[PDB]
Amino acid sequence: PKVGRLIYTAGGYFRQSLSYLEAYNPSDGTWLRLADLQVPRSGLAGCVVGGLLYAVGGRNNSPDGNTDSSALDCYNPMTNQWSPCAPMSVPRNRIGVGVIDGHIYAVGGSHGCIHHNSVERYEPERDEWHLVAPMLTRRIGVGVAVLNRLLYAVGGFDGTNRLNSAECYYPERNEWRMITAMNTIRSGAGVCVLHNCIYAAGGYDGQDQLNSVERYDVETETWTFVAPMKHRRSALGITVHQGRIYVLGGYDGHTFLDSVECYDPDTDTWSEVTRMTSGRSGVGVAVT
């Protein structure tokens, strides 16, 4: 094929919610603009299932109004087209998603002043949503990752407190269990899994955006700091591509970042590999 896997960035915020879909090719550093979202959105989550890109929740924060989204839309790289899917039970801004067994899990997020602890599961082959057990904590700006077929919800804001706690969901049981809490309080952090560990990068602690990064190891059941990113940021996009973590854009209290940093787990170092076509925060990112 002309290209390998690409890192897709959908939506985001800059002065207002965006409809951009762009793709970065790690092999030659080129960016490509694709079909716009049907509705602008930011604070959404992105994931892939069966070669299809999904844009979940978020909100359309515009000059003349704000509308939280319960929408799920699907993008097909093969034809460069967006398709509306069944919507979720409720709008979820600052949502988290994870994929397990080809099913998409929508986690927490908010609707107005409602901070969800609820969680629902989407089955693409049926285009239908079903709620599952709710998290033990209400979490918006929660980070979500999957490890050993278990869904992890990390940090966030419960409506009052910003959290350093994290919990794990066992689909086979439909039970949530708290795990060791992180070193740092983080809402709107970038959370992903890489080489059998969960990473939590950046975020906001209630006083400033963060550049520190920590890693959870399941057999020691502990969170350990790794090399920090060069640029502090919350509401960043994050994904994994061939053994490395990519963080995209974000917000640091002063700027909408276009910076994209890459983490090398073998040397424990971060490098700025490229820049988005324009700075922005709250993007949905995935690789396919």
Ligand X SMILES: O=C(O)COc1cccc(CNC(=O)Nc2nnc(-c3ccco3)o2)c1
d(CA 54, CA 128): 14
Q: Which is nearer to ligand X, 174 or 255 (CB)?
A: 255
Q: How far is the CB of 58 from ligand X (least distance, A)?
A: 7
Closest CA to 214 of 240, 238, 242, 184: 184
- Residue 34 neighbours by CB distance under 10 Å: 18
Min CB(208)–ligand X separation in Å? 14
Shortest distance, position 68 Cβ to ligand X, whole Å: 10
Q: Smallest distance from the beta carbon of 209 to ligand X, in angstroms?
A: 11
Shortest distance in whole angstroms from residue 65 CB to ligand X: 12
Nearest-Å Rg of the Cα atoms of the chain is 17
Enumerate binding residues for ligand X (CB under 6 A). Answer: 13, 15, 17, 42-43, 59, 61, 251, 281-282
Q: Strand 197-204 to strand 244-251: parallel, antiparallel, or no bridges (unpaired)?
A: unpaired
One-letter amino acid of 14: F
Closest to ligand X by CB, 17 or 187: 17
- Closest to 143 in 3D by CA, of 49, 210, 65, 66: 210
Which is closer to ligand X, CB of 39 or CB of 181?
Answer: 39
Residue closer to ligand X, measured from CB, 13 or 20: 13
Q: Which is nearer to ligand X, 167 or 252 (CB)?
A: 252
Tell me the backbone φ, ψ of residue 237, rounded to 5 degrees. -85, 145
Least Å distance, CB 148 to ligand X, is 32
Please, what sign has the CA dihedral across residues 158, 117, 150, 95? negative
219 Rama class: left (phi>0) / alpha (psi -120 to 50) / beta: alpha
Closer to ligand X by Cβ: residue 211 or 281 = 281
